[PDB]
Symmetry: C5
Subunit: 307 residues, 5 copies
């Protein structure tokens, strides 16, 4: 087995796609291994760039294809370099920009943690193995964080391992184990924007919705909630058109549903007060004064949103 | 005829496009067949990656083109591999990401079932036939389902068959039958998000629309429905801007239409009550109290939405 | 002149772009012609796939470039095949996905008819002519129509002809006529979704707008139309954000404008009634009761929308 | 210097992008020049298509690269053709689709004039010059204009000239002048859709906003303008979401701002009338009757929108 | 070390993407260096265009790959040119369109300053160094500025330097320093559109929100703020759907939040006035007349938005 050492430099992690559960990574990859020594011009190592690499491979230079197990589509690679040493060893250097996949849970929306992952594994060779993995994620931990969308809690953690494929080729003696590098980078979302521009106003609006009980008339109390209704709908619109699309409800999504319910419960009470009596217009003076039953009956149902 | 055995590994099914009736599939394809034995370095099978395959084909290596009958556009293929065995046999291994087409009915929207399909068939050869088909869909049935948009029912069902082309080339003796593999994967949509964030509020809103009859005045009853009107419009907007575009009405779409109608029917009654009398302001005390005729006259018309 | 026979198989017509007046077509193209006989391995016709075709052309195999006169950009071509016959003849088979252009009138919007068109013409040769054209549009007429956006009237109509180019090269003897195949496929839009989700509610809303005249007060009548105003605006928004963009007004667009006008005319009358009198608050009892002058004065102006 | 004659056929001008100031052009380019005579099979001129051209260039055929000075990105080129004449001359024919840049002023929005421009100039050669330029813009002036977004004045105006580059290579004797063809096509926007669907309703809405002064009460007059406010906001939304994005205000944009102001001025007057008195509820009978001071005080400030 | 002189011509800086912190740059790059003299046809320098450059590199012509350290993805390069001089020197000329990355702070939104940056560094060679950098940004400072989105303060400032890479290859003697050119161009945003179409109306709206205190009734005062609420929400929607997406709050964003708060504070006061008394309907005549406490209590909290 050939010992291949891998170094991965990560430049930029961006463009998360919530629906597809993908994210974009720009970086370099470096692979080193040793082959039989060679005569290089002078005795300085030889440099082979881009189009020329192909030529050396035709004359039988071994350059194993390393696959990103979890790229969606084939990465855009920039410059490629072979550094051929006279003492045999070989260094492959290439820049890449790729879309990568991972299981991503967005349920705690505005405050969710996520992990960006790279998985490197040789495409054709079970033989030849990964010596060691190094991830130079030379961004910076707690710096421009508030200028950037995601806060990195790395550095990156690595993990070389062996993957067994059951249903393999017609090869069987013992060629079903491939060497796999797995990089993980942890991150949390920058919850600021969503608190101040979504959670907050949603609160104010839901709260204000409660001030319907301090209206004198019944005709006032009822007609007004039809406007609070329209308000939550507009806010749902605004909220859902700007927030990331998902197949499940988020924190915010539930708040909105709550607002919908609070306002509908009120309409039930408001109408009940007016007809649970012993006359015609005896609004249960006590009930129509649940101007406290709601606010904290909602901050009770609102502390079971987090049970 | 050459016996070609195909194995298809399916990594990710994502990005459904409702309007175009397409979906994205990332995976590997493996084809094996046997040709006349060969001298391979050592006697170990020979590996040929990417750019080199082209070269071997120039020297007359037969590698038949296998077409995805139902890809829209040409798939993005990652790494290619030929494994050449000394005892003759040949294995072709390639990664692919492609957009695939299928008839898709989205009429039951939030709770629709769908089937993702691959169709493999040789591009040029009626001769050479498909030995057997294997689909390793190594995701997992009922696991992270609630993190993912689609729930897979699978495993995949396969189907080798023969397709006859009537209008063919100038070849006629009997060369109009092609071997076609057909993979099918079943799935249902994750109806959660749509129930709690769309169906529910739409219900509340339509229900609340009925509380218009518990308004004392007529001026109150009528003026208020103009707001309920605006509310349904807003909700239609919200609904249609976030939901997948289609050329037909869905479940939700009908609910919306229903809301439109309920509110328009009420406006008719509300105005009729006020002028079907024997004076000037004799609102049919009985009629203006169809505060039950509607809710269940709608839950009757609402059980014929599902007849 | 060489006799070239063309067969075009059409798989999918999708992705109409209203603004650019383009549509997407996926299919195969087949060209056959006869050249000087050849020695083929065995005496079975020879198959040449993809990359190899290029090689044969280098050794002087004539394969004339057939251009799609009306593609926007250059088509994505999948697999290519040369079938070389020993008795001379040659068959070119290629899959294609392209964006095609045609004059498209969308003025009758929800119920417009359109025609999808292919135009094939040799790129360099006025010599060599198109023998006959066959379009196998093996979809199905009136079948899944209600699952699909467009209903095909077809089958396709063909028409081989000669195009004369005035301003041509320095060639003049008589080399300005090119053989052009022209395929046409007719289609109508699936007007369902738009009737039930747009035309209908727009009607209800415009109608309901008329119930403003059945309000008792003047303050009621006027203040309320400001809400009907806002409603039409919201509906315009909803309507225009979901409907296809165009540089002209459609049917629906006019309805919307009508709604705008009806509501503005009403505001004029409502205010006129209140001040065309002999006192201060003598609303022309007769006029404020044009609760029929509008509905049918609009179904009169609404039958001149179709004159 | 070689005399190169250029002819440019323009098929389609579409996809204007207001923000980037770019537009899309599909067409053919034709270049002709004369080199030393050649032996062509027969004595008929020779045709060389696509992939073959590259080969002839390897054997030392001179084919100068003509650059589109103002393409954004590199054009998608379809078929290429070399027509090699026995008497020396050479014709290069290629189809192209590119995105082109030009200074574009969109300030008169719905009625702006624009000019679509091509700029052709040899990439490497100051030597060799452009003989003459011909632009066959065979669309049609005033024909389907109302089906198309842009109305072409044209025909196209050409202009061959010499561009001097100051900071040039290490070459200095006098090699800093390049031959540049510059095509211009004039066009005006199809202002229909925007008049009837935007300018008009905006008018109606702004007008109707004035009918607030014909409300009897003060509570009526004030509360109602808060709805007119909301209406303008909605109309701004509708307007800005459908109109082309720009970094400056358009005609329409100003109307909107006007509506905003009129409504705010009214709220000032309405409130002023109610408190500029000698009691408590003495609304300046005269002032509250500026039901004419506004409409024409706005058609005065509205004729200084065009000073 | 080889002395490489670089000149960069910048044609267009466009398409800023706020979320990804990237911008688009179209331009030319020119590299010059000197190698061993050569025999050129005649003694005129030799020109080598596009496809041919590749050939010369195969015969061992050294053309070092210069990487844009900060491109996202790999640039689209148009025409390439080698100018080979007989006296040895070599000039490389290429057009490029690329997406470039930089730290971008958008917190002062409508009036933010930004800097567009290019970073050029040899891909493989620590040897060979950058002689001098020249950026010809031949646009124009304060000219068509009001037609363009961004105003350039330039001209461009350069900075050639040495970057040390710690974790490098197996090379160690002293080969960890690479020559890096860094270009910077300064710019400010054209704040017009946003002042007149966003900041202004937002002001009017927030101001008008204060006129709620000039309402006579309490039922009037409270019911009306529910409409002002809905208005701010609609404006938030309009605002956020048209403005650039970011992970933080901007100036405008805060104004919006302020409007939300002002309107909520008012609802608190309005309700407090009505129940802080010695009876039932004694609205603190003094308090309900904070028609000045707010406007300037907000222009006080509004001058701490800028502390």
């Amino acid at each position: 087995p050939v010992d291949v050492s891998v170094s991965i430099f990560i430049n930029k992690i961006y463009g998360v796609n919530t629906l597809e559960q993908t994210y974009k990574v720009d970086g370099y990859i470096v692979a080193q291994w040793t082959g039989k020594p060679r005569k290089t011009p002078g005795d300085k190592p030889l440099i082979v760039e881009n189009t020329q690499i192909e030529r050396w491979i035709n004359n039988g230079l071994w350059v194993p294809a390393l696959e990103f197990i979890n790229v969606v589509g084939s990465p855009d690679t920039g410059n490629k370099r072979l550094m051929l040493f006279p003492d045999g060893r070989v260094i492959y250097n290439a820049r890449f920009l790729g879309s990568f996949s991972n299981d991503m849970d967005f349920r705690l929306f505005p405050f969710d943690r996520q992990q960006f992952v790279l998985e490197l594994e040789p495409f054709s060779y079970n033989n030849q193995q990964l010596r060691f993995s190094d991830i130079q994620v030379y961004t910076e931990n707690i710096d421009n964080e508030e200028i950037d969308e995601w806060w990195i809690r790395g550095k990156a953690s690595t993990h070389i391992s062996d993957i067994r494929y059951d249903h393999l080729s017609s090869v069987q003696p013992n060629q079903n184990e491939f060497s796999r590098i797995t990089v993980r980078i942890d991150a949390v979302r920058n919850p600021s924007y969503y608190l101040w521009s979504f959670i907050l106003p949603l609160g104010l609006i839901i709260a204000a919705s409660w001030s319907v009980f301090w209206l004198e008339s019944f005709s006032e109390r009822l007609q007004t909630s039809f406007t609070l209704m329209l308000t939550v709908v507009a806010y749902a619109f605004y909220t859902s058109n700007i927030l990331p699309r998902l197949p499940y409800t988020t924190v915010i999504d539930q708040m909105i549903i709550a607002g919908y319910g609070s306002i509908f419960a009120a309409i039930l009470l408001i109408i009940f007060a007016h007809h649970r009596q012993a006359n015609g217009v005896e609004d249960d003076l006590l009930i129509q004064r649940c101007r406290l039953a709601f606010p904290l009956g909602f901050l009770a149902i609102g502390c079971v949103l987090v049970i």
